From Swiss-Prot, chains A, C, D, E, F, G, H:
Organism name: Aeropyrum pernix (strain ATCC 700893 / DSM 11879 / JCM 9820 / NBRC 100138 / K1)
Keywords attached to this entry: Antioxidant, Cytoplasm, Disulfide bond, Oxidoreductase, Peroxidase, Redox-active center
Family matches, as HAMAP family: Peroxiredoxin (MF_00401)
Lineage: Archaea, Thermoproteota, Thermoprotei, Desulfurococcales, Desulfurococcaceae
Principal location listed in the UniProt entry: cytoplasm
E.C. numbers: 1.11.1.24
Protein name (database record): Peroxiredoxin
Binding-site residues for substrate, renumbered to this chain: R125
Amino acid sequence: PGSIPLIGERFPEMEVTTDHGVIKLPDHYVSQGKWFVLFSHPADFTPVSTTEFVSFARRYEDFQRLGVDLIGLSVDSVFSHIKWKEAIERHIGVRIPFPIIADPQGTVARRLGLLHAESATHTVRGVFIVDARGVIRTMLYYPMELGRLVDEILRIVKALKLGDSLKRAVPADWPNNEIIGEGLIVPPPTTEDQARARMESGQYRSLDWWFSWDTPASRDDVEEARRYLRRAAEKPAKLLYEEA
Amino acid sequence: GSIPLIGERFPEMEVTTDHGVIKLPDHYVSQGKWFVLFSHPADFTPVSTTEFVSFARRYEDFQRLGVDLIGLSVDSVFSHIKWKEAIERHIGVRIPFPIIADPQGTVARRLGLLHAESATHTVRGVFIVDARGVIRTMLYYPMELGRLVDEILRIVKALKLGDSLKRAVPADWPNNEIIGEGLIVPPPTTEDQARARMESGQYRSLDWWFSWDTPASRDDVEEARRYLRRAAEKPAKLLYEEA
Amino acid sequence: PGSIPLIGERFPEMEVTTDHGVIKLPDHYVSQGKWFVLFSHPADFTPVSTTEFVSFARRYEDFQRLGVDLIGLSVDSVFSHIKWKEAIERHIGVRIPFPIIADPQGTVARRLGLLHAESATHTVRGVFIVDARGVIRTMLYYPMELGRLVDEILRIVKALKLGDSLKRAVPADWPNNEIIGEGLIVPPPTTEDQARARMESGQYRSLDWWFSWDTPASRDDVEEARRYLRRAAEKPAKLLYEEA
Amino acid sequence: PGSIPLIGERFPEMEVTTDHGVIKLPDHYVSQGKWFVLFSHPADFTPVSTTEFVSFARRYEDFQRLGVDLIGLSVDSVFSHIKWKEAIERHIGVRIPFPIIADPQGTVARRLGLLHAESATHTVRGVFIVDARGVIRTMLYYPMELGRLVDEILRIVKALKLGDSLKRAVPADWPNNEIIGEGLIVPPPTTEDQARARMESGQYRSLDWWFSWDTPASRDDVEEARRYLRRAAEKPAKLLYEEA
Amino acid sequence: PGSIPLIGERFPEMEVTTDHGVIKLPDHYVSQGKWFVLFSHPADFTPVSTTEFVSFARRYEDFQRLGVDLIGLSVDSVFSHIKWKEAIERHIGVRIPFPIIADPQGTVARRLGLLHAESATHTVRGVFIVDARGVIRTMLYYPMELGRLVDEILRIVKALKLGDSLKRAVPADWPNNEIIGEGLIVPPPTTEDQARARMESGQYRSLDWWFSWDTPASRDDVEEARRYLRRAAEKPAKLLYEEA
Amino acid sequence: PGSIPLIGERFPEMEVTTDHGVIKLPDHYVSQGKWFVLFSHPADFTPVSTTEFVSFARRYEDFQRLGVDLIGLSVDSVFSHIKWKEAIERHIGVRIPFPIIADPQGTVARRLGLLHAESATHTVRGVFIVDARGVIRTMLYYPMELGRLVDEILRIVKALKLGDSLKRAVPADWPNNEIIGEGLIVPPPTTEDQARARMESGQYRSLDWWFSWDTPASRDDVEEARRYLRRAAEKPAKLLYEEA
Amino acid sequence: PGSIPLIGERFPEMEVTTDHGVIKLPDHYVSQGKWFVLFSHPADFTPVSTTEFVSFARRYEDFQRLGVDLIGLSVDSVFSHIKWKEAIERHIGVRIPFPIIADPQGTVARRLGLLHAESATHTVRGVFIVDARGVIRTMLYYPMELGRLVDEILRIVKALKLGDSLKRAVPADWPNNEIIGEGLIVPPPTTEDQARARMESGQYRSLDWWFSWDTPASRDDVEEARRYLRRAAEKPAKLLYEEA
Amino acid sequence: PGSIPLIGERFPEMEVTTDHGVIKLPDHYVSQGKWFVLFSHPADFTPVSTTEFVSFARRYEDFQRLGVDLIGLSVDSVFSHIKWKEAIERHIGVRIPFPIIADPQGTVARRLGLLHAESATHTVRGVFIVDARGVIRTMLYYPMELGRLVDEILRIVKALKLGDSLKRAVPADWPNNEIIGEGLIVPPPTTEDQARARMESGQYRSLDWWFSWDTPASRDDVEEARRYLRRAAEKPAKLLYEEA
């Protein structure tokens, strides 16, 4: 009962208007060798949405260091985007450095399947994680009533980039997996001959032919991922409403 | 591909699991239980195994929230029973919750779980469904990347809190950088509501569209923070060593 | 390309969300025995649109005396409507008392044919003048670059109400028609017998059997209409920008 | 409902028969560098229609000063057009200098959406304002019972040409706008960078980044537009029926 | 009902994934001059299916001597295939040397008509006997509750190759036919001249013009076929469950 | 390029003409509480088909003991059926007691999927084994060039009836299975709880939780089944062509 | 209804299997310069059909003298054709020299419209008389219960060949027509000029311009046709059943 | 490539205009318990057609004696039918007693498939032999160039009525069949038990179980059929053209 792009598909070709200008997706980011996180929010001048834009802004440098750009999306105009970003800088002291797509007829929202049953007129809290080839790698759909956990979006990109370069799969809760810790998983054998070569070789730690791992990520990569999760877990030292 | 949506009732279906034949969402609604239905590509795969052990380790935390767990893959019930035996034998962890067998992809196609990474194996989908049978949140992870299971606990804990207190939940709750453990009052949608909100003084406000208070118990806040602290902590002892 | 409601049709049935609440059109106004002017603008926080809201607001009591309610429309959210009305009040000192429809997916815009070729996403400056029976009586379509002449909307309603109560047609430029002045037109004969009776009768002033008129409008009726046009023609004594 | 041309589209390509000859629209006017106002009336030998033809003819030199040609339209024959113009000159003393399209099978009517629900057989009082590139700039739909305000058609053309010439938008009720008087509006910024540049420069008067204006119109341009409205507002010195 | 491949057609072109790798059918076997037996079973880790795989494995060299390769099929994954073959080796002491197709979405099952009314999700016990030209020669459909008689599959391929090589048909129950024993049948005359020539000839034994046979099969080919049926008929000396 | 009935479906309702008269399938046999074997052959007066009719006739009492009736089918007329059975009795000394369906337009053959690519005009050697409920239990498709092994048809019915009555599945090559001999298989557990109870009850011999069996068939049932395969494997004592 | 070929159409192109081999119609006879009679019968081993084959055989040399070949058709197999011709030779003492098409799936029957409502499975007694150019010249449909008069098929071919060679039409009951006897008819005039020329010439015997004839057939031609009818009319000397 | 009624179908229901009045087929004849022969001819005032009408007139009493009525058909008008019948009476001295269908738009001809490839406009020489139940029993299609043999139409009806009353089939060339003379055929047995009963009874003369006959037709019935064929074979005593 709702239509979408899929993991492992090219992000659909589209021209969009942002508060920074008109761009083509995913070409604008592919051309720069950047990943992008496209995320949507129901409407400008809404409180949970404001908390998410402030969370992304606080993490903006972390995204840049990973080679990731951010782009938001709502059904509001570019005039509402400029006005809202001014209200956030005025009342919270936080500049939002990244663009927001203006989608008033829902052209982009319907293309991406971002209109769910909680609202006929406002997008859900969608997330498209797109790599530098323009390929959708992960998609999340949060509802109106619940803000995202932005440190998990950082973990997903870091973990994908690590699995892509080291030719590994990434265990549950990496880098704090209960079985193998910061270990990364060797893709399982898919033939009788490969399963025997795996069991015979002694090259990797194994529970069995279908479960092998090693520890090829650098201490810095592991520490960088732990830092995202430690920030998610810690009560902030000071609240931005307190100082403004 | 096409899907169920947030705010829709979970599609009515009979499914075969390794515990028996059940109707969804009827089977969980009748127990007054939320359920998390999650998919994995194939039995006897390593990332999938890590996620089943992560879910099993959090089984009581899910029971504490009134949440039942149900897995899904295209493998048979026979493969499910044999795989759960190998996990118990090689890792020392029992998997208590059922797994759907979906060999022709009937359930996979109905739920939109076949993406472009594999023609034959489901992605790592997550449907978070409340005790009314309504889809509240959906997550799609790929083959190469295991889920963060403590975020699934935080989503349920925060949705139940929101429903219980008529509040919305800020980014990164209960560690929001603006309001901390604060919860948000839904914004006014009329000129009259906007005037009443600003004349009131019941809430902390940045402006008429951004009001919050602190109505969650200490217990609610610390239980949600405990999930994230567990996600962030280096394990004390790796299960591969003490199997 | 692109359909519309037509003159003489019932305004299409629809539920709409405004910054005052949810209403049904045209029922909400029909039930009250009121006319309504539904007008659209491209986007909140745009300057020509701002001048038109301020113009309607200044004319609000003139519309109320005619038994006409006002309702605006754009594809912005209710949050943008509330914010924009606050901005007008703060910067110009003018309260906008009438509701604005929020149409974020363009459902209403598409139903009313308000998406023209100057913008794929923002409505033209459309005007629907709807009588207390819910019937569309007149429609205007102004472009993004040109503000409306709001006094002509008052002249249209006043002249329609006069024509309906007195069973007359209204000449060009009424009440300053260069042939008959404040005169109103008797509908022309449509049969041979009617045309003979019309000319054998001393009831009306006539140029010929097809052009008859009289002067049945009250002095008050005529002065009311002349005041709208005199307001349109006179430089305002003081500009609201000055008083800031 | 019923389909139409839209603001911002090229006027639909068509050959039409007039009481002056066969012409191609919009080509015939485009090749002269002329705007045209194409207007429709229900039927020849009808009195409101006659008042409107006389109104247009009296303002013929005003339209010529703006580089605007006039063309009428009804479902009557070229023969009825010639007889009706003859009758207006004989009984009222006014020559109609401009052509009228003859549309007996409603070919042009249907193409332009001029058949509304008040009459299955006679066009509404439609108005298409078309610039010298052949583009539709404004459309008005008046009913059978109500004559148009022809001085508003002059104000629309004068304002659009000024807007085009000086790269400005025109406020409500120009040149008597209650906020900025005869001032013209600078199109609002559409990007964060444009919004900052606008407010950092002292180049324009501004309420805020989204509302900037200046006064680039000549006193001649302003007073010619005010003259149209002053004429609409004035009690006629002498009624043409008294000069019959 | 439900659709199928037919005797005398080429086996449908398809790429399939096995626990030995990705192959094209029937090309992978045609290119080798090999016959193949493609057989399906409902699910890995099921007992009748296990008895069938061990029966085929025990006859593997008998198939190899005939120039026939074996390939299984079920809707289980390649991982389950490797795990199940390991379990059969561990618990029964029998290695399954031949590949199994993994068909988890039932793409191959549907193409081959292997989903019957006993199970919506698991294939019947289907058997396709395909010659070295890639042509389907024989098809068997056993149900979930009944294991195949694997020696009949050997007799079929043995008898078809003899019939192909010697240009003969094969009587019921060959090589123990109750009328002609190990005799092979000369295809019957299809014209009046062939029927007379056959009866005039004395070249063959005949009951009548439509029933002629001779004994051209080698003693070795007859003894091989009688050995398959002797093996089917005899109670094994030792049961593999006791040996494990 | 062909559809069939499926295993587990009721045999399709049909009226058929035979050389014993008109009968309804499957009702004619269901009403008697009888299984039937419907088998087809390409044409009357053909030699392989004659050998199969003689094999079935010799095994007629064995079918009767199983409560199985036999019914043939070809595209030939009832007249040809009568003449061919007369020819078999005169030249071979074997009376055919069971009916043959006459199917000259291929109505029955098309309904049962019995026209394959080897002949456009003659059926393949199909077999439908139908139980006393009218349900299709097994289907076999042999080609023009290869006679059936009729004793395997007896073994299938015997094993199916045993599996039905004892609630058991039947291993490969039963009653001579190489793992469990004349053992019959307990359907495997389909739940974690059923699996544990199986492993803990000690009620059955097991290789693992998914492979349990016992030996509940009578010595008579086992030896009766074995006798069919012993007959298939025996060099005939004397060939019917000698004693024609 | 049901669909046939038509008089004056080429006999439909088709490959047919006879008890003499595989031939293309009509080419097999066109390339020899021969007419053919294709006739159908419901089923081999039927008594009316047997009388008609014996009648055709008696008249074989009569057909050969006209340059006409015979070809039969039924839905029975080639094997039944051969057995039936053998049974006719053995029991009646008559050899059938001409081929029969075998049509088991009714492919040819359906193409020629030979399946009528007396039988769903067996053809009617159809007759197609086809000339040396492959053109259908006459068609007869007799039913199951009624044998043909084969002497009328000889009269048709003789009369048609005389008509073609002498450029004449043939009267009713030729060569014993009541009005003109063995006379042949000149095609009638189709113009006023031709009608006047016909009546002025005195070339032909005429009743009126539309009925002219002459006597161009030879003694030998007329006697050959009269012999066919005398044979039809003669009570046989001996009955073939009596010498058996 | 042309559609017809079929043997064993009811004659299609239709109202037809004749030169005797408007009638319903087949009802007009069924209600009288009469058979009818409906026959077509290409055109009135054509010579072969004239000979056929005179032949049917000569045989009128013989058809009446069989309870057969005659009805002609052509695409000519009733006025042509009346004129042509008058011309036949005056020039040939023969009164045509039976009606002719007037079918000027080919409505009847198209319904009965009487338009073949020799003429787009004129019907072939069709014959429908219809029994007193309205059922089509035999159909003949002769071409434009060839008159019918009308004595064979009498033989067909006589033999069909004898078959119907005696429950027999009628041999080739009856009543002068070369095997059984004036004998009639017992329909063959269609079951094994009927075949054995037929052979055992000694009730009928038989060649084999499938060919039995007896002599149940009266002396009068046989002599009446023989008279038709003797007439067909007789050289006319005198020619009608001569005595005219």
